[PDB]
Amino acid sequence: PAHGCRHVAIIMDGNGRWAKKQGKIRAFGHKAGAKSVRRAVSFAANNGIEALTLYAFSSELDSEVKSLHRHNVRLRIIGDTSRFNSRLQERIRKSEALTAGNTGLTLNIAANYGGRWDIVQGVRQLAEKVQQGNLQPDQIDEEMLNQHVCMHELAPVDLVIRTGGEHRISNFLLWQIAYAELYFTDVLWPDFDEQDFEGALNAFANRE
Amino acid sequence: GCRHVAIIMDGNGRWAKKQGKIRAFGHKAGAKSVRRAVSFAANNGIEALTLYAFSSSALMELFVWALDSEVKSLHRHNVRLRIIGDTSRFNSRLQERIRKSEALTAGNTGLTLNIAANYGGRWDIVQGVRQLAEKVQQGNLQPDQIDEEMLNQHVCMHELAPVDLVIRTGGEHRISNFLLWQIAYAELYFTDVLWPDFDEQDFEGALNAFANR
Ligand SMILES: O=P(O)(O)C(O)(Cc1cccc(-c2cccc(NS(=O)(=O)c3ccc4ccccc4c3)c2)c1)P(=O)(O)O
Ligand SMILES: O=P(O)(O)C(O)(Cc1cccc(-c2cccc(NS(=O)(=O)c3ccc4ccccc4c3)c2)c1)P(=O)(O)O
Ligand SMILES: O=P(O)(O)C(O)(Cc1cccc(-c2cccc(NS(=O)(=O)c3ccc4ccccc4c3)c2)c1)P(=O)(O)O
């Protein structure tokens, strides 16, 4: 649409600092952070973004899925969930199945996600195909590896936002950001609101 | 303590026009800015400097000409030179020059200067993946033995200090498929200064940005 941005990824940071400046404990910053997440999700949905990928950075989802479904949002959980107990994982997949048919915003939430791991699990899949006498090491190119990293079915990440002041990727997406616009703001996550998100989108629109 | 700096050199052509001169003038000033960044890195204890020329046969002979004229001086300055990237299709004479220039300076112990030539971050990761696919196909590697540490041993520069800081001049705010795996934890510094103008003062500012942060 107008801003030209189809997929936005956000490294959410700053809740702790935000609460501390208030003189409140971490829990307070967490409640504020979740409010800021709903706000960013509403904003993305109301603005034609096809996909929003969120990453909670730490210098250290069952109630929501319904409101999500009710808002026609499609939900996916990216990250190494292979170790969680089998209950969670089902609970995760249920939430996923449940919204797979929604046509609005596709929301990706990182849980135990790493860009290096993401690349490695994809490598493992190709390795498995090798061991099966189906794939020749020399047939493996970029495109093929690309079909195996998280979110390869969605539009490429156009813009990555990191709030909170740090200027680093911190092992969030790596393969996927090869061409993304990188936008860093000192604003703390709890205070990152619609006008901040719009500012980031207009920065992307005028930059490209 | 910044040990390995990587720079996305951008802005020469745009610089050219602001002067109202041709692209060749910008290239000329860009090469001078390269010598100055390399000199500066070596004078200030930086362990590795990795350079990537961003662009929107000739250059092949230019590469050969550059290596032929500058290696002797890198050598005297105790700099170890490495080219990173797919040089598999460069003509054989340039391939041989690159090999000899690397061989000649391989034992130097000062600054390691990595010049990216036809390099891409994705290609780089895929090159590593192909190597592992071989070991797997042979039966010496199990698909689930493959891990981050293992993959890392097969990406460019894995023998060097980890990239601490990535500088991109020229105004754009993207990695443009330069280093990807290697920048997982690096500080990313963007400046609108055009490459020909990037000098000792701009370089230090980036280093400070790293120090304070
Ligand atoms: O901002 P910080 O780094 O100071 C901190 O609040 C961690 C944090 C960073 C960014 C956002 C949030 C935040 C708090 C609560 C909810 C949300 N997002 S969320 O509801 O989708 C969610 C929260 C935490 C998660 C942890 C691991 C996987 C998925 C998560 C999803 C964001 C918390 P902290 O715990 O390290 O003080
Ligand atoms: O609620 P609406 O439809 O009235 C509106 O907010 C638009 C809107 C569109 C799509 C979704 C939402 C929405 C509102 C509030 C919260 C949410 N999602 S959320 O922030 O609670 C959330 C989503 C996924 C999560 C996964 C794991 C942990 C926490 C999560 C929180 C979605 C709102 P609006 O701007 O039209 O008034
Ligand atoms: O900046 P741009 O994108 O406007 C453009 O100049 C392309 C460009 C981008 C970045 C750097 C350069 C540039 C051009 C030519 C050479 C150099 N560096 S270099 O290859 O001469 C080099 C420098 C020092 C070396 C020392 C020892 C061995 C090899 C060396 C090679 C940089 C050009 P353009 O032609 O696409 O407009």
UniProtKB/Swiss-Prot annotation, chain B:
PROSITE patterns: UPP_SYNTHASE. Keywords: Cell cycle, Cell division, Cell shape, Cell wall biogenesis/degradation, Magnesium, Metal-binding, Peptidoglycan synthesis, Transferase. SUPFAM superfamilies: Undecaprenyl diphosphate synthase. It catalyses: 8 isopentenyl diphosphate + (2E,6E)-farnesyl diphosphate = di-trans,octa-cis-undecaprenyl diphosphate + 8 diphosphate. Changing residue 123 to F: Decrease in affinity for IPP. The record marks 53 as: Required for continued chain elongation. Changing residue 15 to F: Decrease in activity; reduced affinity for decaprenyl diphosphate substrate analog. GO terms for molecular function: ditrans,polycis-undecaprenyl-diphosphate synthase [(2E,6E)-farnesyl-diphosphate specific] activity; magnesium ion binding; protein homodimerization activity; small molecule binding. Changing residue 65 to F: Decrease in affinity for IPP. Changing residue 124 to A: Great decrease in affinity for the substrate. Substrate binds at residues 10-15, 23, 27, 55-56, 168, 174-176. Isopentenyl diphosphate binds at residue 187. This is Ditrans,polycis-undecaprenyl-diphosphate synthase ((2E,6E)-farnesyl-diphosphate specific). The lineage of its organism: Bacteria, Pseudomonadati, Pseudomonadota, Gammaproteobacteria, Enterobacterales. The gene is ispU.
